[PDB]
Design a protein that fits this description.
This is part of a larger assembly, with chains A (251 residues), B (50 residues) and C (50 residues).
Chain A: H1 3-36, H2 49-68, H3 72-75, H4 78-99, H5 110-130, H6 137-147, H7 150-174, H8 186-197, H9 202-210, H10 217-249
Chain B: H1 2-18, H2 34-44
Chain C: H1 2-11, E1 40-41, E2 48-49
Antiparallel strand pairs in C: 1-2
The chains are: A mainly alpha (251), B mainly alpha (50), C alpha+beta (50).
């Protein structure tokens, strides 16, 4: 209606959102932790997707209520924006299942896996709206003091993103016609860079590279490994040490 | 408390994992305790190229 | 029956019978791809071919 409808919606939103949403989301999370459960889905597969679709209908009712609600201030909440994207995507997959017919591949396809991880962040949002009460103040303070120093960690991760990209570029450049069957594309090159950054069989890289005819690629790889390892690990460790050390010096 | 927070984040990100897991790339991502502990091995971050 | 059961246990890597379990008649799930295998038995002699 108007402002009067908005005020009635606010009051009844408080009441019915405290009452109805909590119990239906608790039941949704119960049926979803029974859903995932890759032993009990065969003790099922017929009472599980039914409840999944029923509570997805409950969620689209939540979305309809939030749409008829105050609106722009609802959009101003990032968690509510995540819920809005989750429900647009959810009604998209629901109508995709509903229309049937179609002309693309199905029967547990890549799109089906996409809809499964879609149900996954739906379960995550169910958890995040269940945890409205009693998160416990000790870990409240721990999480706040952890999230206090965001600019330093973002700068450090950006600098190592640049360094990892540069090292991947030079390694792919120097590995041309030198058995790149492990890093034939940009994804596999950056994943091998992830392995060397995470200390995973880079000694094996050394042994099967000196099994090849190139030997000077090993000292370059080593010096890059040690410099980026020491610099990044030490910088992050010291940054978080001090980040909680000011909170230590305070009360 | 750090143990509790790490385990809770580990579970809520394993909900993402188990959607990819079971009956495909199996025998370490299946059974939901083996999957959790294999992801814990990958958290301990040594020799996951197998 | 045995080869079909091994094929079901090797393709989808899982199997579940019905609620009313019967030895002579096994139960098949929809979600599993169905691939029968067939034997030729010669009652006059011993052999059993595929």
């Amino acid at each position: 209606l108007l402002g009067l409808q908005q005020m009635i919606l606010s009051l009844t939103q408080s009441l019915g959102f405290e009452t109805f949403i909590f119990i239906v989301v608790c039941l949704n999370t119960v049926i979803l932790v029974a859903q995932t459960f890759t032993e009990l889905e065969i003790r099922g597969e017929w009472y599980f997707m039914v409840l999944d679709s029923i509570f997805l209908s409950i969620y689209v009712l939540e979305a309809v209520l939030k749409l008829i609600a105050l609106g722009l201030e609802y959009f101003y909440d990032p968690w509510n924006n995540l819920d809005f994207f989750i429900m647009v995507m959810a009604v998209l997959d629901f109508v995709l299942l509903q229309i049937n017919s179609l002309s693309y591949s199905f029967y547990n396809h890549s799109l089906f896996r996409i809809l499964k991880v879609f149900k996954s962040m739906r379960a995550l949002r169910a958890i995040r709206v269940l945890r409205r009460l009693s998160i416990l103040t000790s870990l409240h303070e721990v999480a706040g003091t952890l999230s206090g120093s965001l600019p330093s960690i973002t700068a450090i991760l950006t600098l190592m993103f640049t360094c990892l990209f540069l090292f991947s570029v030079v390694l792919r450049a120097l590995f041309q016609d030198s058995d790149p069957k492990r890093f034939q594309n940009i994804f596999t090159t950056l994943f091998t860079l992830f392995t060397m950054l995470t200390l995973d069989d880079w000694s094996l890289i050394y042994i099967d590279n000196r099994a090849q005819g190139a030997w000077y690629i090993i000292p370059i790889l080593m010096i890059y490994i040690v410099i980026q390892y020491f610099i990044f690990l030490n910088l992050v460790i010291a940054v978080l040490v001090d980040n909680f050390q000011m909170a230590l010096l305070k009360g | 408390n750090v143990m509790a927070l790490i385990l809770f984040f580990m579970l809520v990100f394993s909900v993402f994992g188990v959607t990819l897991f079971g009956a495909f790339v199996p025998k370490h991502f299946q059974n939901m305790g083996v999957a959790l502990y294999t992801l814990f091995i990958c958290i301990t971050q040594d020799g996951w190229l197998d | 029956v045995s080869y079909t059961i091994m094929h079901s246990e090797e393709i989808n890597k899982h199997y579940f019978d019905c609620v009313i379990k019967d030895a002579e008649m096994p139960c098949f799930l929809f979600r599993d791809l169905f691939q029968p295998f067939f034997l030729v038995q010669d009652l006059v002699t011993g052999d059993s071919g595929s």
